[model samples]
Target: ISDGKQYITLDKPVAGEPQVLEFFSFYCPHCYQFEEVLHVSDNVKKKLPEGTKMTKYHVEFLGPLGKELTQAWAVAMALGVEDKVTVPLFEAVQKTQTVQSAADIRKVFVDAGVKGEDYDAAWNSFVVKSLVAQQEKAAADLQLQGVPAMFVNGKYQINPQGMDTSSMDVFVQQYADTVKYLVDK
Candidate 1:
């Protein structure tokens, strides 16, 4: 959704033969650990198979952690600075134990090179709020059990136990293959 506009799902499917949707939460440590395990390509979109695409659907888990992290994510996405916000926020909390609240997270943004005024504006922007609202809806509608869930072709499936399986690299790679197989159908 555009800031100050209604939330809209894309009218058309993403440009790809098959579409992959990853539902993640910034507050979820498992999701954080997963990112570390698998490297997202600089040209991430190119790594998908022809007619295959991926979308990040952010979800919030609970309490203050959910609100603060979800707000941080929405602001970053709205400001077109996810790269600037996501990792730094993670490091500030997950690594250095620096950030604690929504406001503190904003400071992390500033530390990452976002100017004060722009950072504040984005954190308060209508677009950011709207995006967080959308995230809530997606989480409810999908009946997501927890963070770091994946859906292939609008349906989720698992062969082996996901958490029981160590090495997210194995999971991501196998997931990529699963996407290819489903899309090839």
Candidate 2:
């Protein structure tokens, strides 16, 4: 995980299994663009170690909008439609900037085929709220400075700009390669 690049060192690993944690915010333009790039390449899917997993943590530095989107993501997660609505949600924000409230977030999921009432039910459900709180706590514990950050095995953090790559595609590939190296180590 150390390749002469800077990464946030943690006191302890966050999980037993090797995984990648993406600390991001839906309201962050960089996160939206990062998601767009990863969606197209799917490099992490192909390059991550066989047993490694990847997850997203919605950071709350963007204030009310951040909290709303984070809760919306939690709702999507509860509805078992997180993957189904991720791209649409990003597009709704990055392209249209229409996801300004819980209602707007609900509409994105509804457009993604989730039933209206189902989204409403999960929006403020105890489980969703719990997940949101967990993410908030994790982000705080990490002392995260910004979005679009990645953590490998919950120990070594990666900076996209730290990768010695010529382009975004190569950066993702190299990042995954570094992750695999850390997992193996």
Candidate 3:
């Protein structure tokens, strides 16, 4: 998926449908804050109309570490293991910047249940590097200014207009609102 400006095909569009592109980075605290809600909230998941789907574009601009993390994500995708890989990556990295080293990050992946050898293989992989380069180029093309950006159907962002302060579910609700708007359009 693309941010309209960044072009990397995470998934070919479900052919007659528009996809929601979530441009984020593993290094971003804001993204970490919202991940739980986005992944599990029925309010958000139920909003996506028939055919549409979402893709996560881990924007890696924090230098080598960020690039490696993004590549790690791609490795998860390539292995059909993103769902298994992401939460642990978030937990380990967000707790501290210990993932600064590729080796350390691989340890986190292994802790999350990825085989140790597979983690090592992916960590040192040329395929990972190519995906890293591809995503970096896409970020540059997009001229993205920040994390947690969303582009829906070529729209630069699809954010909620109003937000509630009291609900613990605010973030999920806001995201759900955006999805509903995009889907109904």
Candidate 4:
């Protein structure tokens, strides 16, 4: 399912449908680069074969106040405000260092135009929390020890660091190609 270097075929199978799954943390600087500068998210979406869905899991064991950030990320994703909140969350946590608590996390979302009440509601929503729990479990179950990990077909994990990454576009293209190639394996 994976080339020996650029990708690793997982020993334990990932649950659910075969598609792209990204595990990252807002606290991770490299994750910020992957999402914003590297454009991995956008490029993969543009390049994946038809009907290949991409899902994100906000890692809860990576940094301080992780549970709070995980909850906030889940709420934003559920509210369909991830596009509005992702960069702001990244700025708050990774760039500006403004978020230190749940209140500060809420402030980031509110500043991103999410209503405080809406954010709060989703923060406590059963479905959202359930998904958040699943995300956390997925991280631990995968025995993940890093940030900004990507997988295709829930089994082929891309270790892009092994790819020739001097050229950003080529690196990103290889990522997309690897994913497309593994979708059926």
Give the top-scoring candidate (TM-score).
Answer: 4
- The C-alpha TM-scores of every prediction are 0.74, 0.87, 0.74, 0.93
Write one digit per residue (lDDT tens) for candidate 2, span 1-185: 46556344576656546667777777777777666765522565576656567777777787467778888878876777877898898788778978777788888888889999888878869999998998888787667788778777777777556675787676767777766666566
CA displacement after TM-score superposition, residue 3 of candidate 1 (Å): 39
Candidate 1 per-residue lDDT over residues 48-73, each given as its tens digit: 56556666766667435777777777
Higher-scoring candidate on TM-score, 3 or 4 = 4
Error of 1 at 107 (Å): 1.1
Give the least accurate 10-residue stretch of model 4, judged by summed lDDT.
Answer: 176-185
Residue 149, candidate 2: Cα error in Å is: 1.0
- Ten-residue segment with the worst summed lDDT in candidate 3? 1-10
lDDT of 4 by residue, 1-185 (tens): 24777798889967877768899899888899988888988887886777778889898876788888888888978899888989999989977899988999999888889999998889889979898888888787778888889887767788887776779988888887777777755
Judging by lDDT against the true structure, name the best candidate.
4
Query: Count of backbone clashes for each model?
Result: 3, 0, 1, 0
| Preferred candidate (TM-score higher): 2 or 4 | 4
The per-model lDDT (C-alpha) reads: 0.61, 0.74, 0.64, 0.84
Clashes of 1: 3
Q: lDDT at 3 for candidate 3? A: 29
TM-score winner between candidates 1 and 2: 2
